[PDB]
RNA sequence: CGCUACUACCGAUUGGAUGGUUUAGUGAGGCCCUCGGAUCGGCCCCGCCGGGGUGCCCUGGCGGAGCGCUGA
RNA sequence: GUGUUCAAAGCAGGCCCGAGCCGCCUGGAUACCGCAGCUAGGAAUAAUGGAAUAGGACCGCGGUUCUAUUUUGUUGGUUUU
RNA sequence: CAGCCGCGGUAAUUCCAGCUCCAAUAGCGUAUAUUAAAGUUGCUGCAGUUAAAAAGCUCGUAGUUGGAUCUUGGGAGCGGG
RNA sequence: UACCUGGUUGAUCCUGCCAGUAGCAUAUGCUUGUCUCAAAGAUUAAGCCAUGCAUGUCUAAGUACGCACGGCCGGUACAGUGAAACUGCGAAUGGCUCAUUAAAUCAGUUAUGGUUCCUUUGGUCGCCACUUGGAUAACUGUGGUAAUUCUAGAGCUAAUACAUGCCGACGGGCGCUGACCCCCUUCGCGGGGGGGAUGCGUGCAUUUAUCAGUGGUGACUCUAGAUAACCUCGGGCCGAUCGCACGCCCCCCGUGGCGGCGACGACCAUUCGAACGUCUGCCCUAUCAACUUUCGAUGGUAGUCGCCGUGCCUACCAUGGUGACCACGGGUGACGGGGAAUCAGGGUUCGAUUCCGGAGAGGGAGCCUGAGAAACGGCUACCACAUCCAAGGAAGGCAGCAGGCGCGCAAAUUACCCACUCCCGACCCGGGGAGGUAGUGACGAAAAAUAACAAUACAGGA
RNA sequence: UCCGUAACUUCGGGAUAAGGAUUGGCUCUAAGGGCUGGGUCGGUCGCGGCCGGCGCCUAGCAGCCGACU
């Protein structure tokens, strides 16, 4: 789509600017240096958990996960847990041993079935050779009568 | 768009014919690719079926075949010398199918040395003993000697091919479609086909 | 025009589905499948109109997604699945096990077989070829691909499938003196003995079939289908045995049997 | 021949009005190739730090730099 | 073909029966579809062809050539039937 | 008034009205295209002395149309009056 | 039912026309009680449109820190419903109209041994691995402009989104190098042979060149095989992938798997098709007799582009191709066909109109995404028209359902429902002015009311 | 230079009708010609001088020259 915009250069003919200060010298403006919001939510995948607390893939991850307290909800200050993705568990490992043991099959099959090759076709070749005897006979009738 | 349709032309009787429908999308062309020589640069194209073509635009290396003895190798394309279809493409150095070129000769030299053990390319005294004397060894005589001696009445290379090696670079032809593929493949000239194109080049000089 | 179709009208339809003109505007449009569109029988038609279990189509949906019906072993929950020919339709809850074979007039009648004999089927060969590594291959007419035939199997020949893992058994050839059944044209749903193959290089080949009662007709070879080793079919057959008794004969039969057959 | 009514014909005016097919110039925009490189990142070039081992580098905390090859 | 209350239409419908039959019988035909195109039979009618500066046939017979595997067991090469 | 022929100029079977009758009947008139009648566009199937109509006469390419003639019987296996 | 009547004259017989006669389809005039079916802005303007609807979608199985409910159970991450947002699929079907268009579309008929194909079905599926990186939505909060389905800056957070990149496997097997060694023979040479360290490569599909000739055809430069190299480069492919329930077997004291699904992938075949070709067939006009061609007309040779074959395009050559058996040019109240009316037999006329195919979305042109579009209820420009406006700028396409203006001889309700038929989707659950259902309706078609009866009389009759 | 050109006519013309485009420097390509040799093998003497049949570029080669468009 076609749309109108203004360039990057600044002059008088504006209405509003957006400015981001990068460091504070000394004075601490009250509107922007006394109060502070906390980061509303925490991480959710294991790798950023271990990045934060420096846990190093020796000890678990479940015990070191942030809990959200239920302030102002009404009555009960419950507390909740996010869910973790990219985690190792009995299910993902069960899935993996299925596929891989089934993917050593599909080549152990087709090899169990190469047994069927050797069996099915490579006996039927071995069966049609005891035949062809009508043929080598029927062209012996050509050759040497 | 750039179309390829055959309803914009005249009939067999030279009678006009009118556009009973407009441009479609399945009847297209695109701009030509006109591959030249230099460092590799390829652009990729999406086409009917969701498949791919590859516009090559600049190529230097190719796979070429000395077919008498069936050895393919990878070499650097030097220059373009003749083209039957048109005579401007040589001035601008475009690679299309059945263009005649010049290439390096060192790989085919090296294989021949390693195979028949003989000095391909007569140099007076400049080339006889840096390493071809080091090539000439018969460490297990009487076991490979009969072999390499049997690989003796099987070389008999032509006079004209020798002159090319002795120069440094030799003729070839192209057999692929680069704006469709992205490759330069081809073969070496030999025999009467070689005679033919030599005559054309030399006459062009006049 | 600018894409493929999704609907089908109702007076556009095949003639053997027997659709009522003054009932609606559309017909079920068999979905994509191994059998053609004209020579098939979708699941709704076999089940709502013939058997008359259900009286709507929504009812058919309510029964298919219970996983009772199953086509030729492998269950199918796509209500618009295109049934074929010589196939098997096994509910097996109440032991039905249908077979889906033509009548004499070409209408895909119902044919009940036993619990046994519902565990195989027969298939015509369409082509053969060898893939990679010299591994032969074989394609039937119902889009079912099978490696490693016996090398004494050629095109337009019949095989008996055990229906669990493919596993061909009991094959037969194309030759004079063996039964045949028709699948197209005008002599549909008739049986006979082949007796000849007149062939033309560059066109369609032809057979001159003869029925036992005396009739002798001819077809294109592609509409042919083989079921017997000579007077001996390997399957249960329907009422009529592929005859096409003429209109005057039916007139005697029914009138004479009318108010005397009861 | 004279009066009366109607239809068509020629007719100066380089007549006029609708359409349509095209020549020659100017030629919006999209697409292709050749360039261009606001901007946003790393191996880093080093200097300030550690852990690990063996004085070595691989990973986690500090500042600059050829605007190199990429990555866009 | 079928008493839709007849008909126009439409493809349905009918049976025994305490109603038990937890069901039974059924139907959803057939024809026409000019002209070109395909397939097999018949050969009157209409058009064309064949031997005239001669040609068909005869283990036909000589002979100048290539000569593929048949025999030369496997072999090296030639004529070899 | 009247599709056409025609009615009305002091006794109107035709105008304006009333009695009476006729035809179709929940339908009937009016206008305009279009079929049959049309053997008045004619292959089936017209006409061409005088009613409309055969070039002033002759030659001539494409087109259309073209003489006679080449195996007939007598038999054979049969079924009737 | 293969049919006729009046009129030229003072009378007759003939040519010959004018008028009557029966149907059918559009309009109007007069009239009207029942009931079953039932067409309807085509003809003139493919002229213009206010207002309102017609395309969206969640399973046991892609992402769940909504805190909106309240499970339950604690805190070993997450029972469970679950708005919004991200992801994948559909929006190219359907519906509407007939302006164009004259061997063109189209009907039958045959070919792709000259090509593409989402989905379905079946086959094959040989030190991120006991699991790597950062990226933004939903959310929190500061705002602009009068203006819209306009958006920015700041702080966090996920994947089957976007990237990255292992293990497994036998020196097992194959081929050409071959150090070395041996046997027999040779006076040696010759020969006649064996084992053999170290090497390089070693597939599915790609590109090319050569060699011999498992399976098939009327028809192979086919399918398969062998050798040398290449990667169509990291904007080449596959070797190799994430989720849900049921519960587990273990020479066993933690491993190897199988069982049962879903999703995706590289190649082959099928299925839905699509698109380029072959043979034959069309209305009127000669006051339309020559036409086409170095501004490709007709062939050849080489290539580019193209999913493939082809003057489809480019260079170099040749001078050809059509025509009285009607080319060429022009007209059509010309979309085509299955078919409709009339009809002794033969014919004449209509066919926009519910089925198939084609074309188009105000007139023209060019494109993105996608398997598929030169889309139009997708984008961008010029022309003609046209709505807001704070005068700076923004938004548009009823030949879709109802409705309106104009136009004219001439053509219905801003109604109810997804219950039937079918379609779409992540789906037994959601949507559908496609579709059904009532309303106006003497276009038209079928049945059928508006009196029956017995005495009183006689006009009279047998 | 390349296209395109009416009325009217004593059919000769009108016609340079009217009306449009292009026009440089430099680097390249293609086409357009001439003369000479082909009588060579043996016989024969001093590169040449006589003889019988050969191959004749018999589908046009090689060599050397030259100005213009
Ligand atoms: Mg008429
Ligand atoms: Mg008649
Ligand atoms: Mg007449
Ligand atoms: Mg007659
Ligand atoms: Mg006369
Ligand atoms: Mg005759
Ligand atoms: Mg008179
Ligand atoms: Mg009349
Ligand atoms: Mg029209
Ligand atoms: Mg039509
Ligand atoms: Mg369109
Ligand atoms: Mg409009
Ligand atoms: Mg468009
Ligand atoms: Mg649309
Ligand atoms: Mg619209
Ligand atoms: Mg409307
Ligand atoms: Mg009306
Ligand atoms: Mg009626
Ligand atoms: Mg003048």
Curated annotation (Swiss-Prot), chain B:
Single annotated GO MF: structural constituent of ribosome
Crosslinked residue numbers (Glycyl lysine isopeptide (Lys-Gly) (interchain with G-Cter in SUMO2)): 169, 192
Membrane association type: Lipid-anchor
Keyword Cytoplasm belongs to the record: yes
Residues where N6-acetyllysine is found: 36, 127
Primary location group: cytoplasm
Residue numbers bearing the Phosphoserine modification: 159
Keyword Cytoplasm: yes
Phosphothreonine sites (modified residues): 129
Feature: compositional bias, Basic residues: 7-25
Domain of life: Eukaryota
Cellular component per GO, a single term: membrane
A GO BP annotation: translation
Sites of N-myristoyl glycine lipidation: 1
Keywords: Acetylation, Cytoplasm, Isopeptide bond, Lipoprotein, Membrane, Myristate, Nucleus, Phosphoprotein, Ribonucleoprotein, Ribosomal protein, Ubl conjugation
Subcellular location: Cytoplasm; Membrane; Nucleus, Nucleolus
PANTHER family linked: 40S RIBOSOMAL PROTEIN S8
Official protein name in the record: Small ribosomal subunit protein eS8
């Amino acid at each position: 789509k076609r749309k109108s915009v203004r360039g990057c250069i600044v002059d008088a003919n504006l209405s509003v600017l957006n400015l981001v200060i990068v460091k504070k010298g000394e004075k601490d403006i009250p509107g922007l240096t006394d109060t502070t919001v906390p980061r509303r939510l925490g991480p959710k995948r294991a790798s950023r958990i271990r990045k934060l607390f420096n846990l190093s893939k020796e000890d678990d991850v479940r015990q070191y996960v942030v809990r959200k307290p239920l302030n102002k909800e009404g009555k009960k200050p419950r507390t909740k847990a996010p869910k973790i993705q990219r985690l190792v568990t009995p299910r993902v490992l069960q899935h993996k041993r299925r596929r891989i043991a089934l993917k050593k099959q599909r080549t152990k099959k087709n090899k169990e079935e190469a047994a069927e090759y050797a069996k099915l076709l490579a006996k039927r070749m071995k069966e049609a050779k005891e035949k062809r005897q009508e043929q080598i006979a029927k062209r012996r009738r050509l050759s040497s009568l | 768009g750039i179309s390829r349709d055959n309803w914009h032309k005249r009939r067999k009787t030279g009678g006009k014919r009118k556009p009973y429908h407009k441009k479609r999308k399945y009847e297209l062309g695109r701009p030509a690719a006109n591959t030249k020589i230099g460092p590799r640069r390829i652009h990729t194209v999406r086409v009917r079926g969701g498949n791919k073509k590859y516009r090559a635009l600049r190529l230097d290396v190719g796979n070429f075949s000395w077919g008498s003895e069936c050895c393919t190798r990878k070499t650097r394309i030097i220059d373009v010398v003749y083209n039957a279809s048109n005579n401007e493409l040589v001035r601008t150095k475009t690679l299309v199918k059945n263009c005649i070129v010049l290439i390096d000769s060192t790989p085919y030299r090296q294989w021949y040395e390693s195979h028949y053990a003989l000095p391909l390319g007569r140099k007076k005294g400049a080339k006889l003993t840096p390493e071809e004397e080091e090539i000439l060894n018969k460490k297990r005589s009487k076991k490979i000697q009969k072999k390499y001696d049997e690989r003796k009445k099987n070389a008999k290379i032509s006079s004209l091919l020798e002159e090319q090696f002795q120069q440094g670079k030799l003729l070839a032809c192209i057999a692929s479609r680069p704006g469709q593929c992205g490759r330069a493949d081809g073969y070496v000239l030999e025999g009467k086909e070689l005679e033919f194109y030599l005559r054309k080049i030399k006459a062009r000089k006049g | 025009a600018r894409g493929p179709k999704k609907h089908l009208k109702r007076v556009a339809a095949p003639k053997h589905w027997m659709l009522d003109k003054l009932t609606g505007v559309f017909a079920p449009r068999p979905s994509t499948g191994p059998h053609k569109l004209r020579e098939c029988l979708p699941l709704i038609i076999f089940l709502r109109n013939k058997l008359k279990y259900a009286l709507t189509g929504d009812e058919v949906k309510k029964i298919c997604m219970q996983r009772f019906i199953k086509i030729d072993g492998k269950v199918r929950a796509d209500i618009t699945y295109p049934a074929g020919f010589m196939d098997v339709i096994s509910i097996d809850k109440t032991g039905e096990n249908f077979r889906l074979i033509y009548d004499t007039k070409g209408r895909f009648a119902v044919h009940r077989i036993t619990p046994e004999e519902a565990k195989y089927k027969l298939c015509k060969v369409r082509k053969i070829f060898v893939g990679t590594k010299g591994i032969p291959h074989l394609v039937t007419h119902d889009a079912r691909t099978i490696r490693y035939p016996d090398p004494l199997i050629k095109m337009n020949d019949t095989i008996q499938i055990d229906l669990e893992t493919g596993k061909i058994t009991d094959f037969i050839k194309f030759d004079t003196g063996n039964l045949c059944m028709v699948t197209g044209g005008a002599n549909l749903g008739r049986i006979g003995v082949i007796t000849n193959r007149e062939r033309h290089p560059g066109s369609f080949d032809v057979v001159h079939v003869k029925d036992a009662n005396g009739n002798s007709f001819a077809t294109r070879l592609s509409n042919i289908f083989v079921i017997g080793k000579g007077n001996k079919p390997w399957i249960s057959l329907p009422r009529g045995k592929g005859i096409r008794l003429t209109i005057a004969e039916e007139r005697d039969k029914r009138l004479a049997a009318k108010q005397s057959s009861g």
